[PDB]
Design an enzyme around this catalytic site. Sequence first.
Site, PDB file in Angstrom:
ATOM      1  N   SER A  25      93.444  21.512  -0.349  1.00  0.00           N
ATOM      2  CA  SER A  25      93.148  22.909  -0.068  1.00  0.00           C
ATOM      3  C   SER A  25      91.930  22.976   0.841  1.00  0.00           C
ATOM      4  O   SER A  25      91.209  21.992   1.024  1.00  0.00           O
ATOM      5  CB  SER A  25      92.919  23.707  -1.355  1.00  0.00           C
ATOM      6  N   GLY A  77      90.142  28.495   1.734  1.00  0.00           N
ATOM      7  CA  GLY A  77      91.503  28.094   2.019  1.00  0.00           C
ATOM      8  C   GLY A  77      92.485  28.602   0.979  1.00  0.00           C
ATOM      9  O   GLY A  77      92.173  29.445   0.136  1.00  0.00           O
ATOM     10  N   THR A  78      93.701  28.069   1.054  1.00  0.00           N
ATOM     11  CA  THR A  78      94.755  28.469   0.138  1.00  0.00           C
ATOM     12  C   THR A  78      94.514  27.888  -1.253  1.00  0.00           C
ATOM     13  O   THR A  78      93.791  26.903  -1.432  1.00  0.00           O
ATOM     14  CB  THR A  78      96.121  28.025   0.660  1.00  0.00           C
ATOM     15  N   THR A  79      95.136  28.516  -2.246  1.00  0.00           N
ATOM     16  CA  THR A  79      94.989  28.111  -3.639  1.00  0.00           C
ATOM     17  C   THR A  79      96.134  27.180  -4.023  1.00  0.00           C
ATOM     18  O   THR A  79      97.307  27.561  -3.938  1.00  0.00           O
ATOM     19  CB  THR A  79      94.962  29.332  -4.558  1.00  0.00           C
ATOM     20  N   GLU A 133     100.420  26.872  -2.089  1.00  0.00           N
ATOM     21  CA  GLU A 133     100.652  28.173  -1.478  1.00  0.00           C
ATOM     22  C   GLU A 133     100.394  28.075   0.016  1.00  0.00           C
ATOM     23  O   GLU A 133      99.346  27.574   0.434  1.00  0.00           O
ATOM     24  CB  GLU A 133      99.752  29.246  -2.103  1.00  0.00           C
TER      25      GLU A 133
END
Lengths: 144, 240, 233, 250, 242, 86, 241, 243, 244
Positions: free
Chosen positions: H74, H29-31, H46
């Site tokens: 996340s 996933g996103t950070t 993010e």
Amino acid sequence: DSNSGGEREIQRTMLELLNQLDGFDDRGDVKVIMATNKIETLDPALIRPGRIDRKILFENPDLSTKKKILGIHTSKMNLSEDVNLETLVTTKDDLSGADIQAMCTEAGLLALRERRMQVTAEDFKQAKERVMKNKVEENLEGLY
Amino acid sequence: GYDRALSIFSPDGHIFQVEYALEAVKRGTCAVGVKGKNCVVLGCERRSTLKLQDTRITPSKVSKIDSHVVLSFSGLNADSRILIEKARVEAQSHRLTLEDPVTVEYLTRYVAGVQQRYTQSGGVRPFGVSTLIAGFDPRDDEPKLYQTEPSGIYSSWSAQTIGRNSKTVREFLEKNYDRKEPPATVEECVKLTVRSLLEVVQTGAKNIEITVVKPDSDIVALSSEEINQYVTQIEQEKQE
Amino acid sequence: FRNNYDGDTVTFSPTGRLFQVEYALEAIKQGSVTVGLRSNTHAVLVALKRNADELSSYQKKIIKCDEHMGLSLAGLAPDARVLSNYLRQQCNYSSLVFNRKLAVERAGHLLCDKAQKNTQSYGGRPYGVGLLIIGYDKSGAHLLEFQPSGNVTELYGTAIGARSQGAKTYLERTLDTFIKIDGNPDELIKAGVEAISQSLRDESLTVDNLSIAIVGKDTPFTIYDGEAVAKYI
Amino acid sequence: MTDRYSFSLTTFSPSGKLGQIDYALTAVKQGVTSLGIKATNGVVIATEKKSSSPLAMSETLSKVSLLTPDIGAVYSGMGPDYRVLVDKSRKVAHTSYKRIYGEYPPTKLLVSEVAKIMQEATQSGGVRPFGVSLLIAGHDEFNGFSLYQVDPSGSYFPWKATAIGKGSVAAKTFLEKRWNDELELEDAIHIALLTLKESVEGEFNGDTIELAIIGDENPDLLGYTGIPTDKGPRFRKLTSQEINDRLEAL
Amino acid sequence: DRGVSTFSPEGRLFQVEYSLEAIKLGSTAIGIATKEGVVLGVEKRATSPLLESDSIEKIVEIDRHIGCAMSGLTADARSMIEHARTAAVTHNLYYDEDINVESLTQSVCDLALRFGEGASGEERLMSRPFGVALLIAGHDADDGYQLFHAEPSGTFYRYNAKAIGSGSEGAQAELLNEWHSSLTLKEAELLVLKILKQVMEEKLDENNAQLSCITKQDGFKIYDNEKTAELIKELKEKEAAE
Amino acid sequence: FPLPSEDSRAQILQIHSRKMTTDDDINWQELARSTDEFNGAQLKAVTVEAGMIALRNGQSSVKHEDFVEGISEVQARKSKSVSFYA
Amino acid sequence: GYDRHITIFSPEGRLYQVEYAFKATNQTNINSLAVRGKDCTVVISQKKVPDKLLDPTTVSYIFCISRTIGMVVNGPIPDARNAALRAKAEAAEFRYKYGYDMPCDVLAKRMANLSQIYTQRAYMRPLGVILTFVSVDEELGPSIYKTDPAGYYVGYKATATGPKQQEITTNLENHFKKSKIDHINEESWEKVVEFAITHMIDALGTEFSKNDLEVGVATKDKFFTLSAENIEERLVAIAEQ
Amino acid sequence: TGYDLSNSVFSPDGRNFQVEYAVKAVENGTTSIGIKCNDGVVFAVEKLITSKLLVPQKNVKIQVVDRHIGCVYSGLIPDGRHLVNRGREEAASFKKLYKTPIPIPAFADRLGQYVQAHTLYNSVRPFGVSTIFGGVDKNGAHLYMLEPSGSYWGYKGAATGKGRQSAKAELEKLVDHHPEGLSAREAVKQAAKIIYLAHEDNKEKDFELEISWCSLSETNGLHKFVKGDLLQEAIDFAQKEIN
Amino acid sequence: GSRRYDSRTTIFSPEGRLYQVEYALESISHAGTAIGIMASDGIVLAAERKVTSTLLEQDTSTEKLYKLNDKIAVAVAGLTADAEILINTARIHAQNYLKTYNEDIPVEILVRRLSDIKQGYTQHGGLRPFGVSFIYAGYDDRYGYQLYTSNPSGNYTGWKAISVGANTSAAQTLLQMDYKDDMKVDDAIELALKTLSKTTDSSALTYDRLEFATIRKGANDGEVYQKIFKPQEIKDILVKTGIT
């Protein structure tokens, strides 16, 4: 146990018999006949429709045809005066062809151990009753 | 809540586990149902071959759900006993709520619904026994012979058998019993019923039990000595 | 990967991403294509209606949840009826308690939790139905796409169905078109017709296929069919 | 919340017996050797404690608990399952009896309720059977002295002298030859110390041996006598220091 | 498992997809929706002369103006019939007006589109997916006579001419040509018997064939054995000249 | 080696068609978007089938419609006998 | 095979899942040292030192269940907080039904049975942690009960965990044989804490600073945990000898 | 092996594979990052841009527990949203009974037992996402990240996702910058630069910056999303550093 | 057929019999032999015991011999533990008819209730059936003496003399050969002891290994007398019958 083959053997074997009829066209010569106990679990492709147009079902012989098989095995057998061939046929219920000669073999060994010429009617009675129920006497559960 | 019901659905649309309930008829004891013009007769087979077995204290396959309605079955006595109990409770509930006697058509809808509800719902195994429900309509002498299959469907038959060699007995019913002109006399319906049981019982007496149902709530079971009276007349007809 | 790992919604992958999430997206591609967009005034949803034969009635993909809201089903039939009836009660529950109409942004959050209940617990069928939810509130027009994983993302426009990449590409050319168009529903309807035609193989162009429904500050949500959509087509 | 077949109690052995019973008797067969003897004037039970870590305290682990002091108990089976079983046995003995008859529960009724607890684990799916082998020794005024053995299979049978553990096969022959019906409680205590010693001869002292007998009613163990009619506790647990006194005289 | 809880990697399901096999193995059910009312018929498939065809029914009357054609397993269909009769009367309890046939079919599908046992937020009356399909017909004051098809899997469709059962694929090609919007009541009855006789191997009589019609004046009327035989004789007169 | 992009498929399809005979009316920018996630082998089969369409119809050159017809084929999940849909 | 994944008995008549509960106990590799003194109980557990992005103060293997009661857990930390809330709930509910301070011997019985119920259930899995309860009892004084994850509990003079527990148990075994007493002299609880640190360093062979260890203290009618300045003060008097 | 086929099974290593694979699912996933200051905390996440059709700055993965606590996560978006809604009812139920806001260190205690129960039941699927939360309670600034295994600890800085360790290199520099730690406003500009640094390998797709923080010296313990000139100032600072 | 599938009670075999049931009587056949005998003047019940240990007390405990009420007295052949609940449940149902109707319960009312209990495990739920062989010896005025046998089924079958457990076919042959239509009580005792002697591998056939309970109105002085016979009296009977 000794010869297994794994799961890959099923594909290379059952399809090999198919590749004989499917891989060659022979008009009048090779006639392939297949037989086993149950053909339903077999691969429908292994059946190869159009080569076999006839389906033959097997059933146990009725009481009318049992006298022909019984008369052959008892032709060389010595029967007493109280022994009737129509009685043994009526007693037989849902039996194969080997079961007709089995009762003649069992009744013949009973008189052979006692060294008797004509087999007494008691040996025929004990043979038809015993061979009837040996392995599975009961359904073990409920009435079915 | 246990499982959804029956998995895999089977490839042919008929689940093998459901088919095992239908195929259970072809082995066990045979019951040949028949009906005449003025009455109905349900035959049953109880095996007396086992020695030292009391046949008086053992109830046969014939059970009375209503005064004018009986029930005959071939299969497991455990699964059928529930079918007998649940039907008689509904037989009394129908007379309690509607105050009218038990309708032969409505009774089979509930009995077939018992096997249906347990088959459709999950966690409960389907019954492996089939019952033959025969009764008389209120203020009517015309017999009604129905059948409840474990698959959850019901159908009516003039003469229908359940048991081993049912295909052979079914041919005996069509070649003798005529839907257009059934035998009017009771003696003819009883003798032909025993003849249908001669292909299974294979020359026996205590294994054959005949139950005659008469209108106006009249039901009597033929004694073993009375059954042999009809068998004696059948043996004389075989040589003719 | 039949059975083994990932055969159940609880079992995970060796990578960590459940394949049942990716397999649920394939059900959207098997269904009918639905193209939609919005603007600062109105919002247009163009749904394709197929059938079996000429005698088969074309199934309407647009289901009306609220007077000011609307959705479309590109996915399985039974999974939407449970969600459509659930969102139907939420519109009346918000009007009974909070008296305010169900917000499109708030509808996607509650709908996101409904899809996980099948994957979080054992049994049942997860929700893979594509859903495009529109509406008009005091915040303006909003279109929130519902993914089979449960994620909800708001876009100016998108498309769900077979070969949806063709319709999404046409929205890139018109990205500066429909946004600047305000108070002109005619240009917004024509944008949805040419968007779905790029993805389709041109089977049937008649008026019994494309279903156009528009909602805005003046005209509420209305399902147009027959001679209503025959003007542009 | 129910998951599929998780109640499945299908496991069965090809011989027809429950496979959970054979695996339960197998673990008890390797366990520490306990025993018990029912004599004419008394009943004696004895078992060896658990060493494990050398810093462990023998007073913490008690292999003989107390339900009501008409009956003793000893177990060679599961350690943890004994604490759960006693907690459930008391609640059943209190609800079905003490909340009705408000007295000490009889031996025949108490054993029948303990056998149901082991059955409910086997009857209810998903729960493993109790692997405890219990020796229930009690004295009533009807049957007199009674020594019962409750197997993990859920059935109970009376025994004059019996032993359970690793040396249960060897001790069964020892109790036949050494012990007889004519021997009294004092004669059975010496046999219980010799039979238990033959199992593990590492330490024969009273620190690793827990001995308890059911004798005549003692008025000092009850703590109060206002009524000469009320009988005192019949169960008396012997101190490890008292055990060493009989070992020197044996 | 390969059940409703196991989702196939190809984007489909197992148990419900195979349910169409039970529909294809069912009895032939043919019907035609016209402006003069829908004429429905089925094949009861008598397996023996001892079978009583009047007791068994593959056509069940849900309402006076609304009726269905049952082709498939009678067990799985009867549970929907009891819910169809209940829902049709329940709608008359809160309204007392003639309900739309599509609305009644949707109400039947509301129970028929849900399956399983374990559910977090809703009760499950059913249990397993049913392999039976019905053809629902009726009449209302809005769109007139309508004919539907009951599918437990997906959403039902409105079909003017639909054939299901063993003769589904055989009779479907004939419904794409002979069907026309101007077909009268007499032409619709003769066309169903003509197509049903071709897809049926046995002889055509009143025992194995039972038809019914849904009109405005008479509602749902079941053709008896006397009138059904007369319609067969009218078909023989048309086939004699052709 | 992921699947080629729009501009990547347009140059691959153009090279395989250099040995063919067309009317130069074909715009590969539209065909690049008609191709959705095709590998290097699936792009080569486009020019192969495009020549077979004009061969069976007796066409002297391959027009732009032959490329669209050659790409379109069932494969996939199409022709569904499965339930649900709706 | 499947016999390892089933909750019921194995073909050897011995549960493998009970053995697998101890596999997760060695993940943290924490060596705990707790001894029973005269009037006090000293508990010392190793505190793993992470990088600078974590707070070492928030990291603790010892939690306060109730008054005078404390628990050190060697095993999975996320599984420990779930078990810590179970002991805290049973501590307050015990006083409402009785009204006296809950002893340690009974607290070891409740958490053992609840962890044992998980062994019988086919859904809930057993706790893979180690429950060591320490307190000062009124009648029995200092007592330490180490509850096994399968529901077994027994008292120890000096408990030891981790892979190095053999070094701690043996070094403290011969120390108790010379004095022939389970307690420790110098009734004042200040020097008793310092006596356990020296025996722990000599057994492990490595001297740990104030940030490498945490020291629990159980006194009469009071329970607390030494801070960074108190632990550092203990090493000062130990250094002078 | 066969330990990963069934849920909640003890492996010979001591931890289930599905629990181990749940940690690897966060990197997909996103950070999202975080910074713990003296008087408050700062959150920086993010959001990836799918295509040019995405509406800038609408969907916000930053969740706010009551008014005093922010919540970010996340990995899987739907699996992390249900955990937020669970904490919403718990933070409200605690405010009803005890008439007080929930403290940060005890806020993970209610969710700790909740997430732990999902790794126990067989029919219940464990959580595969990591959650970062914080705010200003009566005890001051606190920062805690909830692991998918159900564990949490005091964190002077927070990092999760694919670029979690790429952020740790920058987060550890704040310790060497000042011994007392950076201020609340100074951490906003530093948290923005980390997003651009962790995106160097993510350049295949676009991104949008979303920053939120809560401090006592500015909003008096009220979580507020960064907007206006404060957002453009942090973006311009991070744009010149990546040059 | 090919693979043996035994998982759930709903699963049916191609033979039509649940594999869990296959071991129900085979476990009962593994236990002792219980042979009931119904006579004209009463009913004689005789059963052996599985325990071979001498240290066990067989005088004060009857494993297979139980008493449901003053009239109905049955014999449990099968797992002893799994039958303990069905026995107490039978005593509850027997008192329910006696509580409501103030009359002693007959055999048919008790068997029909215990029949659905066995099927209740196999029908609904994932539980297992408890294999038990019930031999019902009751008393009835309408039908006289009644003797039934309940397998782990849910059905009942009337029998004059029934044999279950080990050597089922071997003991039934000895009963049908020596069967008499008169069937007195003293003759039924001899046929019970002589049959168990040939089936049991022990030729001595000690008194403590047998359960002797006789329901008879033909006792001494022409009166109705009911007793549970202790092994002390059994030893004297084995000497009179010629066994010892």
